mmCIF file of C-alpha atoms in Angstrom:
data_model
loop_
_atom_site.group_PDB
_atom_site.id
_atom_site.type_symbol
_atom_site.label_atom_id
_atom_site.label_comp_id
_atom_site.label_asym_id
_atom_site.label_seq_id
_atom_site.Cartn_x
_atom_site.Cartn_y
_atom_site.Cartn_z
ATOM 1 C CA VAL A 275 -13.871 11.652 18.520
ATOM 2 C CA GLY A 276 -12.325 8.632 17.135
ATOM 3 C CA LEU A 277 -13.571 6.176 20.166
ATOM 4 C CA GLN A 278 -17.253 8.455 20.238
ATOM 5 C CA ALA A 279 -16.749 6.808 16.632
ATOM 6 C CA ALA A 280 -16.112 3.826 17.122
ATOM 7 C CA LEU A 281 -19.015 3.476 19.695
ATOM 8 C CA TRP A 282 -21.923 5.340 17.194
ATOM 9 C CA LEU A 283 -20.232 2.777 14.234
ATOM 10 C CA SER A 284 -20.960 -0.321 16.784
ATOM 11 C CA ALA A 285 -24.175 1.944 17.149
ATOM 12 C CA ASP A 286 -25.022 2.818 13.038
ATOM 13 C CA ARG A 287 -25.140 6.496 14.241
ATOM 14 C CA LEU A 288 -23.581 7.452 10.904
ATOM 15 C CA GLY A 289 -25.694 10.458 10.222
ATOM 16 C CA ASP A 290 -24.526 12.142 14.334
ATOM 17 C CA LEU A 291 -20.656 10.363 13.512
ATOM 18 C CA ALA A 292 -20.612 12.538 9.512
ATOM 19 C CA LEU A 293 -22.117 15.484 11.372
ATOM 20 C CA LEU A 294 -19.795 15.506 14.068
ATOM 21 C CA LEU A 295 -16.741 15.162 11.346
ATOM 22 C CA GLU A 296 -18.636 18.298 9.080
ATOM 23 C CA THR A 297 -18.275 20.340 12.517
ATOM 24 C CA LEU A 298 -14.804 18.590 13.337
ATOM 25 C CA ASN A 299 -13.381 19.651 9.907
ATOM 26 C CA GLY A 300 -14.760 22.959 8.407
ATOM 27 C CA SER A 301 -18.345 23.042 7.758
ATOM 28 C CA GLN A 302 -17.881 23.736 4.512
ATOM 29 C CA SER A 303 -17.438 19.676 4.141
ATOM 30 C CA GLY A 304 -21.280 19.546 4.936
ATOM 31 C CA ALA A 305 -22.663 18.793 1.440
ATOM 32 C CA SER A 306 -19.871 16.003 1.495
ATOM 33 C CA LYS A 307 -22.159 13.367 3.724
ATOM 34 C CA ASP A 308 -20.050 10.397 1.999
ATOM 35 C CA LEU A 309 -18.177 9.105 5.501
ATOM 36 C CA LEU A 310 -15.114 7.888 3.797
ATOM 37 C CA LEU A 311 -13.897 10.808 2.479
ATOM 38 C CA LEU A 312 -14.811 12.907 6.076
ATOM 39 C CA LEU A 313 -12.352 10.161 8.011
ATOM 40 C CA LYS A 314 -9.563 10.768 4.983
ATOM 41 C CA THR A 315 -10.365 14.525 5.516
ATOM 42 C CA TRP A 316 -9.754 14.324 9.504
ATOM 43 C CA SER A 317 -6.488 15.401 10.097
ATOM 44 C CA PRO A 318 -5.207 14.046 13.312
ATOM 45 C CA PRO A 319 -3.401 16.787 14.708
ATOM 46 C CA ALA A 320 -0.145 16.624 16.188
ATOM 47 C CA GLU A 321 2.487 14.169 15.933
ATOM 48 C CA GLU A 322 1.508 13.809 19.886
ATOM 49 C CA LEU A 323 4.106 15.482 21.573
ATOM 50 C CA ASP A 324 5.295 14.463 25.028
ATOM 51 C CA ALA A 325 2.752 13.409 26.795
ATOM 52 C CA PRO A 326 1.185 10.888 29.350
ATOM 53 C CA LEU A 327 1.377 8.364 27.860
ATOM 54 C CA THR A 328 -1.498 6.062 26.025
ATOM 55 C CA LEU A 329 -2.131 2.920 24.676
ATOM 56 C CA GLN A 330 -3.756 4.029 21.049
ATOM 57 C CA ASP A 331 -4.096 7.452 18.940
ATOM 58 C CA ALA A 332 -6.178 8.981 16.696
ATOM 59 C CA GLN A 333 -4.495 7.844 13.597
ATOM 60 C CA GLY A 334 -3.929 4.330 14.885
ATOM 61 C CA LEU A 335 -7.788 4.443 15.479
ATOM 62 C CA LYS A 336 -8.621 6.721 12.150
ATOM 63 C CA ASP A 337 -7.087 4.053 10.756
ATOM 64 C CA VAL A 338 -9.367 1.187 12.169
ATOM 65 C CA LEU A 339 -12.245 3.515 11.027
ATOM 66 C CA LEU A 340 -11.723 3.758 7.263
ATOM 67 C CA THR A 341 -11.477 0.035 7.317
ATOM 68 C CA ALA A 342 -14.524 -0.598 9.362
ATOM 69 C CA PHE A 343 -16.559 1.870 7.285
ATOM 70 C CA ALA A 344 -15.766 0.934 3.962
ATOM 71 C CA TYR A 345 -15.887 -3.157 5.091
ATOM 72 C CA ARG A 346 -19.388 -2.296 6.940
ATOM 73 C CA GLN A 347 -20.850 -0.022 3.374
ATOM 74 C CA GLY A 348 -19.278 -3.133 1.200
ATOM 75 C CA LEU A 349 -21.378 -5.950 2.446
ATOM 76 C CA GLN A 350 -24.319 -3.163 2.525
ATOM 77 C CA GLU A 351 -24.326 -2.675 -1.273
ATOM 78 C CA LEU A 352 -23.601 -6.097 -2.224
ATOM 79 C CA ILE A 353 -26.790 -7.909 -0.264
ATOM 80 C CA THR A 354 -28.890 -4.322 -1.610
ATOM 81 C CA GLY A 355 -27.477 -5.729 -5.207
ATOM 82 C CA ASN A 356 -25.427 -3.330 -6.141
ATOM 83 C CA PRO A 357 -22.027 -5.486 -6.427
ATOM 84 C CA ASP A 358 -20.056 -2.625 -8.733
ATOM 85 C CA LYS A 359 -20.660 0.338 -5.991
ATOM 86 C CA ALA A 360 -19.059 -2.577 -3.538
ATOM 87 C CA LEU A 361 -15.216 -3.488 -5.297
ATOM 88 C CA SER A 362 -14.801 0.419 -4.933
ATOM 89 C CA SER A 363 -15.089 0.003 -0.356
ATOM 90 C CA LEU A 364 -13.588 -3.776 -0.831
ATOM 91 C CA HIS A 365 -10.632 -2.671 -2.138
ATOM 92 C CA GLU A 366 -10.196 0.309 0.124
ATOM 93 C CA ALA A 367 -10.852 -2.548 2.719
ATOM 94 C CA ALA A 368 -7.681 -4.830 2.013
ATOM 95 C CA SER A 369 -5.777 -1.246 1.602
ATOM 96 C CA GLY A 370 -4.833 1.109 4.489
ATOM 97 C CA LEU A 371 -4.986 -1.361 7.616
ATOM 98 C CA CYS A 372 -6.268 -4.938 7.161
ATOM 99 C CA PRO A 373 -5.323 -7.586 9.520
ATOM 100 C CA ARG A 374 -5.723 -10.891 7.671
ATOM 101 C CA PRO A 375 -8.945 -12.295 9.277
ATOM 102 C CA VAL A 376 -10.231 -9.045 7.356
ATOM 103 C CA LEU A 377 -8.687 -9.765 4.690
ATOM 104 C CA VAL A 378 -9.706 -13.387 4.068
ATOM 105 C CA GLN A 379 -13.596 -11.706 4.196
ATOM 106 C CA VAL A 380 -12.939 -8.876 1.837
ATOM 107 C CA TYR A 381 -12.023 -12.105 -0.294
ATOM 108 C CA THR A 382 -14.649 -14.442 -0.162
ATOM 109 C CA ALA A 383 -16.684 -11.536 -0.467
ATOM 110 C CA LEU A 384 -15.599 -9.913 -4.101
ATOM 111 C CA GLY A 385 -15.790 -13.797 -4.684
ATOM 112 C CA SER A 386 -19.572 -13.285 -4.377
ATOM 113 C CA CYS A 387 -19.057 -9.404 -5.851
ATOM 114 C CA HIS A 388 -18.119 -11.158 -9.610
ATOM 115 C CA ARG A 389 -20.159 -14.393 -9.111
ATOM 116 C CA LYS A 390 -23.372 -12.165 -8.914
ATOM 117 C CA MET A 391 -21.628 -9.417 -12.176
ATOM 118 C CA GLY A 392 -20.989 -13.017 -13.803
ATOM 119 C CA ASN A 393 -17.973 -13.329 -13.618
ATOM 120 C CA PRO A 394 -16.797 -16.738 -12.364
ATOM 121 C CA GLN A 395 -13.255 -16.719 -13.284
ATOM 122 C CA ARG A 396 -12.008 -13.318 -11.281
ATOM 123 C CA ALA A 397 -14.546 -14.782 -8.467
ATOM 124 C CA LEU A 398 -12.572 -17.945 -8.241
ATOM 125 C CA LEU A 399 -9.233 -15.972 -7.784
ATOM 126 C CA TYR A 400 -10.624 -13.677 -4.898
ATOM 127 C CA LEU A 401 -11.427 -17.377 -3.678
ATOM 128 C CA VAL A 402 -8.546 -18.872 -3.777
ATOM 129 C CA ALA A 403 -6.648 -16.333 -2.363
ATOM 130 C CA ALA A 404 -8.782 -16.248 0.931
ATOM 131 C CA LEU A 405 -7.991 -19.886 1.027
ATOM 132 C CA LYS A 406 -4.382 -19.758 1.402
ATOM 133 C CA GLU A 407 -4.093 -16.671 3.847
ATOM 134 C CA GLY A 408 -7.420 -18.096 5.280
ATOM 135 C CA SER A 409 -7.203 -19.050 8.599
ATOM 136 C CA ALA A 410 -11.084 -19.052 8.286
ATOM 137 C CA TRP A 411 -12.005 -21.603 5.305
ATOM 138 C CA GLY A 412 -15.854 -22.283 5.483
ATOM 139 C CA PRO A 413 -17.127 -19.276 4.189
ATOM 140 C CA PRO A 414 -14.803 -19.532 0.499
ATOM 141 C CA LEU A 415 -15.851 -23.046 0.027
ATOM 142 C CA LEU A 416 -19.517 -22.060 0.724
ATOM 143 C CA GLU A 417 -19.166 -19.444 -1.749
ATOM 144 C CA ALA A 418 -17.508 -22.021 -4.267
ATOM 145 C CA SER A 419 -20.700 -24.408 -3.902
ATOM 146 C CA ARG A 420 -23.251 -21.004 -4.529
ATOM 147 C CA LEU A 421 -20.936 -20.902 -7.581
ATOM 148 C CA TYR A 422 -20.808 -24.688 -9.039
ATOM 149 C CA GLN A 423 -24.868 -24.403 -8.483
ATOM 150 C CA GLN A 424 -24.349 -21.195 -10.995
ATOM 151 C CA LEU A 425 -22.394 -22.596 -13.248
ATOM 152 C CA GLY A 426 -24.509 -26.280 -12.546
ATOM 153 C CA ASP A 427 -20.799 -27.986 -11.605
ATOM 154 C CA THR A 428 -22.663 -30.491 -9.733
ATOM 155 C CA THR A 429 -19.405 -33.255 -8.634
ATOM 156 C CA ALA A 430 -17.346 -29.557 -7.701
ATOM 157 C CA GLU A 431 -20.830 -28.476 -6.043
ATOM 158 C CA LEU A 432 -20.738 -31.356 -3.621
ATOM 159 C CA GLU A 433 -17.210 -31.949 -2.967
ATOM 160 C CA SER A 434 -16.850 -27.939 -1.801
ATOM 161 C CA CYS B 177 43.202 9.785 -13.836
ATOM 162 C CA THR B 178 42.842 7.603 -16.939
ATOM 163 C CA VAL B 179 39.674 5.059 -16.899
ATOM 164 C CA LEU B 180 39.904 1.168 -17.309
ATOM 165 C CA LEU B 181 37.184 -1.016 -17.523
ATOM 166 C CA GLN B 182 38.184 -4.184 -17.202
ATOM 167 C CA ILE B 183 35.641 -8.015 -18.400
ATOM 168 C CA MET B 184 36.426 -11.836 -17.456
ATOM 169 C CA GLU B 185 34.432 -14.560 -18.712
ATOM 170 C CA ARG B 186 33.023 -16.802 -15.740
ATOM 171 C CA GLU B 187 31.215 -19.418 -18.279
ATOM 172 C CA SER B 188 34.833 -20.129 -19.587
ATOM 173 C CA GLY B 189 37.818 -21.553 -17.289
ATOM 174 C CA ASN B 190 40.026 -20.767 -19.796
ATOM 175 C CA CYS B 191 39.615 -17.123 -19.495
ATOM 176 C CA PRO B 192 39.415 -16.677 -22.826
ATOM 177 C CA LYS B 193 38.001 -13.391 -22.816
ATOM 178 C CA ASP B 194 40.058 -10.458 -21.169
ATOM 179 C CA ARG B 195 39.013 -7.512 -23.071
ATOM 180 C CA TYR B 196 39.236 -4.148 -21.177
ATOM 181 C CA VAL B 197 38.896 -0.738 -22.611
ATOM 182 C CA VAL B 198 39.808 2.426 -21.917
ATOM 183 C CA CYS B 199 36.473 4.508 -21.606
ATOM 184 C CA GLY B 200 38.373 7.924 -20.872
ATOM 185 C CA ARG B 201 39.791 10.087 -18.642
ATOM 186 C CA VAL B 202 38.946 12.486 -16.031
ATOM 187 C CA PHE B 203 40.522 15.421 -15.084
ATOM 188 C CA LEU B 204 40.002 17.796 -12.174
ATOM 189 C CA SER B 205 41.565 19.986 -9.963
ATOM 190 C CA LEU B 206 40.754 22.551 -6.992
ATOM 191 C CA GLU B 207 39.471 25.427 -9.641
ATOM 192 C CA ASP B 208 37.019 22.425 -10.891
ATOM 193 C CA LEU B 209 35.815 22.485 -7.736
ATOM 194 C CA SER B 210 36.415 26.102 -6.511
ATOM 195 C CA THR B 211 33.260 26.771 -8.312
ATOM 196 C CA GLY B 212 31.870 23.996 -7.001
ATOM 197 C CA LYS B 213 30.928 22.507 -10.423
ATOM 198 C CA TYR B 214 31.015 18.398 -9.218
ATOM 199 C CA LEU B 215 30.165 18.599 -5.814
ATOM 200 C CA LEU B 216 27.232 17.592 -4.306
ATOM 201 C CA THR B 217 26.249 19.733 -1.571
ATOM 202 C CA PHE B 218 22.800 19.343 0.252
ATOM 203 C CA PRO B 219 19.480 20.787 0.118
ATOM 204 C CA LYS B 220 19.682 22.893 -2.401
ATOM 205 C CA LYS B 221 20.192 20.407 -4.430
ATOM 206 C CA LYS B 222 17.123 18.493 -3.368
ATOM 207 C CA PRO B 223 15.581 19.083 -7.498
ATOM 208 C CA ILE B 224 17.754 16.392 -8.405
ATOM 209 C CA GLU B 225 17.659 16.853 -13.096
ATOM 210 C CA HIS B 226 21.219 15.221 -13.399
ATOM 211 C CA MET B 227 21.103 11.681 -13.093
ATOM 212 C CA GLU B 228 24.771 11.503 -12.800
ATOM 213 C CA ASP B 229 24.162 12.848 -9.196
ATOM 214 C CA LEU B 230 21.680 10.421 -8.333
ATOM 215 C CA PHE B 231 24.190 7.432 -9.226
ATOM 216 C CA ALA B 232 27.036 9.282 -7.343
ATOM 217 C CA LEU B 233 24.443 8.674 -4.236
ATOM 218 C CA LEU B 234 24.112 4.966 -5.346
ATOM 219 C CA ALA B 235 27.822 4.175 -5.187
ATOM 220 C CA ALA B 236 29.249 6.543 -2.659
ATOM 221 C CA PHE B 237 26.543 5.772 0.237
ATOM 222 C CA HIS B 238 26.746 2.756 2.670
ATOM 223 C CA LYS B 239 23.942 0.378 1.330
ATOM 224 C CA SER B 240 21.969 -1.928 3.491
ATOM 225 C CA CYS B 241 19.678 -4.398 2.482
ATOM 226 C CA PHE B 242 16.128 -5.618 4.544
ATOM 227 C CA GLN B 243 13.494 -7.821 4.103
ATOM 228 C CA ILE B 244 10.251 -7.118 5.904
ATOM 229 C CA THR B 245 7.662 -10.186 6.409
ATOM 230 C CA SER B 246 4.335 -8.560 8.646
ATOM 231 C CA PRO B 247 3.068 -11.980 9.248
ATOM 232 C CA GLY B 248 -0.470 -11.587 10.593
ATOM 233 C CA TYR B 249 -1.122 -8.522 8.963
ATOM 234 C CA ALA B 250 -0.404 -6.612 5.615
ATOM 235 C CA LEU B 251 1.906 -3.977 5.288
ATOM 236 C CA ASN B 252 1.204 -0.839 3.379
ATOM 237 C CA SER B 253 2.073 1.585 6.587
ATOM 238 C CA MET B 254 5.912 1.284 4.607
ATOM 239 C CA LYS B 255 3.700 3.965 1.522
ATOM 240 C CA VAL B 256 2.811 6.103 4.603
ATOM 241 C CA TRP B 257 6.290 6.166 6.383
ATOM 242 C CA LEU B 258 7.476 6.760 3.127
ATOM 243 C CA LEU B 259 5.769 9.529 1.741
ATOM 244 C CA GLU B 260 4.453 11.003 5.345
ATOM 245 C CA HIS B 261 6.828 10.851 8.203
ATOM 246 C CA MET B 262 10.245 10.682 6.186
ATOM 247 C CA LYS B 263 8.463 13.034 3.229
ATOM 248 C CA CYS B 264 10.395 11.300 0.102
ATOM 249 C CA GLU B 265 9.746 13.196 -3.063
#
């Protein structure tokens, strides 16, 4: 199911994914058409007793999905102009598995969220953080340029 | 057993201030313990509500410390392990 879910979430088939998880859980979780609830409500079933080996388990996937789906819901809501629905999912992104390149993204992104809400100082911090834990520091310096036009800080804009 | 807390100063290399204080006395016996009363015997004393009992375990037990750096990740599995796999109260 995690796998099926990895495919369909690569394929944007979230209606069916929800649907699978609804039959998976109680179909009572049938009104609950949010994913981020169903993914959590889904319990991987066993401590996975002495079986044939694997490379990966439901937990270690379930945990990739929460972080991935949440990340995608977040960028959707930002670009689509809801930098208030965003911040919920973009902090659900840093929390549960978030490899550091995933984080530098979460952070440039919250730099926009707050630049869009008109919080230049809250933005700036998330951008400095993205700098340091950065291995990938084009996109933050870009978000800074876009912030220094928006305040008009022109020498700073050009330098960023 | 009489119970004696000694204090020396470390700023001053005169050791000018060797105060002490006899901070009381503890009488004990087999008839005290024949009826529990001071032991800690485990899991029944799960619900830990006389803080003496917690501090007993923080002196008597063998303390080992650890730094944990996960340097191509951040680090939240701890809370799960702690609360889940170990079932911490």
